[PDB]
Symmetry: D2
Subunit: 337 residues, 4 copies
């Protein structure tokens, strides 16, 4: 008896989730899609031979009682709207980042879920299902390196478009680190501070690139985090955690080594999409399985999406100030531990 | 409209395929299982909450017209029997290695499939779906290193049981290399030759371990291949292909690096099962998808299973002779290219 | 016709230079040693079978006209005294770090050398002769990665003594990075800023360990630099330079890899002395050779020692202030380019 | 009081030893050189500003009582002549490989040294002084991986000249492995067997390239050894030793890693000379030091040179026969352990 899923937002990553659920995972199907370009969410239904109803809007989709779960995977701001609706409609919502564009918007969503008595919100912070990050998590839980003291990490991308702006670096990009990092160390962030190095020749004039970002936590962990999205050479994610008695570090994507013309190479990816393909799969599948065999969602909480929003805000605030901004977090509700 | 699958042989790897098809892949279900220990193939139906009929034997299972595909995943010799039946019953057969224990048994199976006009036989040589081996394949197809000249490889295992015998090394074990190697280089084997090094202290008395194995091909490619199944340190697969202008080499399983107490370590697996978990998944899924969207199977042919059998035989013949045995292969039928 | 060398300061590193010059390098000998513990200098002359005169003090040694070059390898704050003397005595001075303990003390030494018309001062910043750092230098000079934008680096040590204090971290330790880094990028430092993470359990109570240190340059290069001297696992130097179009990174000390008990290890050094043994050798030898075939010294200038002093000061100033200190450098004298 | 050294054979490697002893090592000088092109030896004495006598022949040089040690660095088949002379002249001989071109020629040289009562012969098998091979040696001596069972290794070179012939592969080239390998495992060779793979496009027509070479020892260790001297990509030495409980493997030459245009490279050498530069240095220096402080030579014995000769012969015998040749070794003289 499979899980009936409605996708709100048949975009490019909305299309990747539809294709994975259709042709790759187990125990779910797409029965309902709405888009704001109604013709596109009608191109998608034909393209993946779906048996789905095309709604003009989220409301008429959440209306349908066929659907017990929605993928929210449209624009960055048109999320908070759709999520809040689906919480009251008593459906299961998987929400792609961001949870909502504003810190309070996340808070309004937390409050709703608290009422509704059980977890229906999973935030699409896929890094927690990547095997690399799980091994890291594993070791830290086992105290392998003892108490964590520093973290060094990088999020690098070959080039970006004309539509890519100085804040997107802390909003669209550094956001995943922001999630995965505190997940790992089990601490709350206590201050951000941006620092701009020399501007890159590959960066457009309207964009500040690269940029370091330093983050203290309550415990005393210090994290410097490089974001450079015009690095030209590849898409590359790096994370090294120094602890009291040792160091653990994230792996490279598996590659065949080559020996040719003087050099001993491995391979570096160019397409951000390709880097996490398998964590997407594991992540959705866990949404499904966690529902059919538990009656609630499992992954990153709606609260975790709030911490992202607060800290993303702290960042963009230090981006234009050059100062050491703060991260104030409202008390963690009992509903969450 | 899903694919209805009958598993003949609810063993330990029969159980892994059932669990993957049930809870991990898309577009198939298990409706029919038979085992020779009828109570075990009744423990399995309860354990994975299946909706399946428990048959006393293959015949009564192939009888059922619910099932259009069988997993043959029981004993090593009780394969040739079940496969040949399912070819005449006009079902789709996925067969775990070996195809059949004897070289002619593979030949009897080829002849049957040739009649039946289309490919219904996929042999479970999973290495072709491991991302490592695909990258290797990719590079060779692109002539990256030019013409292949030598191959060095190893199949190593921590320890083995009392039931593990000197021939199983070339039959159960070196068999995958034997498949994947000629797949890659696109050549037929022309001679084997075993060579025994000093016996290991970890090997039991009744077993010869390690052993090198040298294989020429028609083209002139030379392959030495180490098999050491009491290596004690881990399960480890290595393959390096030297060519005219360069060298390509298989990767290590992804690992987090650690720095602690003098050493800079990564991690090595202990459980042969864990090494290929993802190629199993991709492999089954491709059986399914290749059927529902093509009306035939895709992967390794029944012919490829024959080449395994001939060459496995050539080996065990050189195992007890100490001589340079030959590999004679009947002409490749037009039905196959 | 060999080079006649006087060692002022027959300490433990004074002794290593004496042993290398005696039994390892070419074209020089020790003919004169003074120490402040006069008995230790006589026991040294006997230990390495030298043909040398034991002076009571630097002055009587610089007096001797046998000697045309001195190694100053005495207790730290003793350097400025001895160097200034040897500049007026018109000898060649090789000075171990620091050049002098105070920024102006370096300035007094610069002014003296400017008068004396030729370079007689080489500062013992050996990192410039390590093959790793030379390869880095090479690449940057060839614009391989284009314009440098960031640098990440680490200086880690297993444990330290009771005599090791919170400033020694920026004075004895981070000092080599401070030299080698601006050498590489060809830029002057423009600001330091210390940041203290959680204190380590391996650090004594009187010591702040670890600590990050952030350094901007004039050009815009940003450098974070970790110093952790109770890291427990080994002695380890790391330096990664990110540029506009690529990344270059320093190597590990050569090691044999091992496969044993689950892990795939290389080796990490424990003794800070062992890490640079071969740069010391190359460095002294270049002092010698550069003299006998040029009539002046070659390596790091007395000026470069001044930049270390200014910047070392900037650091210890930001160490106790928690603020973003500045690095003001007097104009580079024409005598130096 | 330095060591007075006569070089017989002022060739290209004769010249490298002269330059190292003159300008790089400690406690020795060149006072006497002879060459068969007498004009080349006079031009050498001028080039390196030596204080040396130019003899017309070895005899008149060994005549001189100034010299107490000779480097024999002359054309290959010229060695046996000069060495035997210098043994009777009672001088110290450092002999570059080969010791002598024929197996009995080595035997004649062993017999002479046995009479003369002390070791004056050091064979120039430098691999024993390379830090890699020393680490390997170290581990094996400590039983890290337990009992050695197999060895895989490779000697690869970019391209060779027109003067490079199918036997030089086992004579000039595989000879160093032949020495270093039995040194390491502490065993005598018991059989060789050549095997030719597909001929390379980079190899000239008159040369068979690559070639495998399989060597059993008495103990049961099996060694396959690849020689490919037109591999085109670099000069590359690889050696992996598999043992009962683990695997140890030789390192790569230290390199800076680069990230650029899709790839994560290190560097591979092109010039065979550059690979061992530091083992040459350590090797000569140990000749010197071992003499001045022991009154005999230390390194590889004249016996070890004989084992190379026997085994080199065994190989070239299996090179043209395609058969499994044998290695018969006369009893090891008590003079040698
Ligand atoms: N977690 C990750 O690593 C990751 C990766 C990529 C994208 N994303 C996120 O996914 C979301 C979409 O990403 P994209 O790059 O595919 O964007 P996209 O432009 O392809 O998708 C937006 C689509 O949604 C539609 N739309 C907007 N508002 C809607 C609404 N209220 N109801 C129905 N349809 C609506 C638009 O017509 C458009 O087709 C973004 O929030 C982005 O941040 C996350
Ligand atoms: N491709 C691979 O890497 C790989 C890995 C593991 C196992 N295998 C293969 O899978 C097969 C089974 O492996 P296993 O280790 O799980 O063995 P197993 O002992 O667990 O499975 C055998 C089972 O089949 C049953 N059986 C025997 N003949 C039967 C028949 N004719 N009809 C129905 N049931 C029958 C037995 O009762 C038993 O339960 C073997 O051929 C083995 O070589 C392949
Ligand atoms: N650059 C490097 O790689 C490096 C490495 C290690 C040490 N050092 C530095 O080198 C210097 C010496 O180090 P060390 O470990 O040998 O010190 P040490 O304490 O072991 O020895 C110093 C010796 O010099 C003598 N001495 C002090 N002042 C003197 C003077 N004015 N005249 C004559 N003798 C005097 C002392 O009696 C003592 O015997 C220090 O500044 C140290 O920090 C540099
Ligand atoms: N072990 C190693 O790492 C290593 C490395 C390179 C070369 N080698 C070997 O060293 C030897 C010399 O190599 P090379 O490259 O210098 O050779 P080369 O051809 O460049 O020079 C040989 C020189 O010695 C002279 N000579 C020959 N016979 C003589 C004799 N009887 N008396 C005096 N002079 C004589 C020649 O005139 C010539 O000038 C060869 O056997 C070579 O294979 C060993
Ligand atoms: O949202 C994505 C992604 O998270 C990366 O930060 C960046 O490489 C992409 O260009 C961006 O659009
Ligand atoms: O069939 C398996 C496998 O293919 C391996 O060769 C070996 O490690 C196992 O023990 C064997 O039983
Ligand atoms: O450069 C070194 C290094 O920092 C060591 O950690 C310290 O013990 C030494 O005193 C110093 O000279
Ligand atoms: O040891 C070397 C090596 O094998 C080179 O490939 C060869 O050119 C030299 O002649 C030989 O001495």
């Amino acid at each position: 008896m499979s899980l009936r899923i409605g996708v709100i937002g048949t975009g490019a990553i909305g299309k990747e989730h539809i294709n994975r659920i259709t042709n790759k995972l187990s125990g779910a199907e797409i029965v309902a899609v709405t888009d704001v370009n109604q013709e596109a969410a009608q191109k998608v239904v034909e393209q993946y031979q779906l048996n789905a109803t095309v709604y003009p809007n989220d409301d008429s989709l959440l209306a349908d009682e066929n659907v017990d779960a929605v993928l929210v995977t449209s624009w960055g701001p048109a999320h908070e709207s759709s999520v809040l609706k689906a919480i009251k409609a008593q459906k299961y919502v998987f929400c792609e980042v961001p949870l909502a564009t504003t810190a309070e918007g996340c808070m309004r969503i937390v409050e709703e879920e608290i009422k509704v008595g059980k977890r229906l919100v999973q935030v699409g912070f896929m890094r927690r299902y990547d095997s690399g990050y799980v091994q890291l998590k594993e070791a830290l839980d086992n105290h392998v390196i003892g108490e964590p003291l520093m973290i060094h990490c990088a999020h690098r991308n070959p080039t970006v478009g004309d539509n890519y702006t100085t804040d997107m670096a802390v909003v669209d990009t550094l956001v995943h680190e922001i999630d995965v990092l505190h997940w790992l160390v089990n601490d709350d962030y206590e201050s951000v501070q941006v620092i701009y190095p020399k501007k890159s020749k590959n960066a457009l004039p309207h964009l500040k690139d690269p940029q370091i970002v330093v983050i203290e936590t309550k415990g005393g962990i210090v994290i410097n985090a490089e974001i450079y999205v015009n690095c030209k050479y590849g898409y590359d994610i790096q994370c090294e955690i120094v602890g009291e008695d040792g160091i653990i570090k994230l792996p490279e994507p598996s590659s065949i080594s080559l020996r040719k013309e003087g050099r001993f190479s491995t391979d570096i990816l160019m397409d951000w999409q390709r880097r996490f393909v398998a964590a997407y799969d594991v992540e959705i599948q866990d949404f499904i399985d966690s529902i059919q065999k538990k009656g609630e969602v499992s992954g990153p909480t709606a609260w975790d999406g709030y911490i992202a929003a607060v800290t993303t805000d702290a960042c963009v605030k230090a981006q234009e100030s050059g100062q050491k901004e703060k991260v104030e977090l409202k008390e963690k509700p009992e509903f969450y531990q």
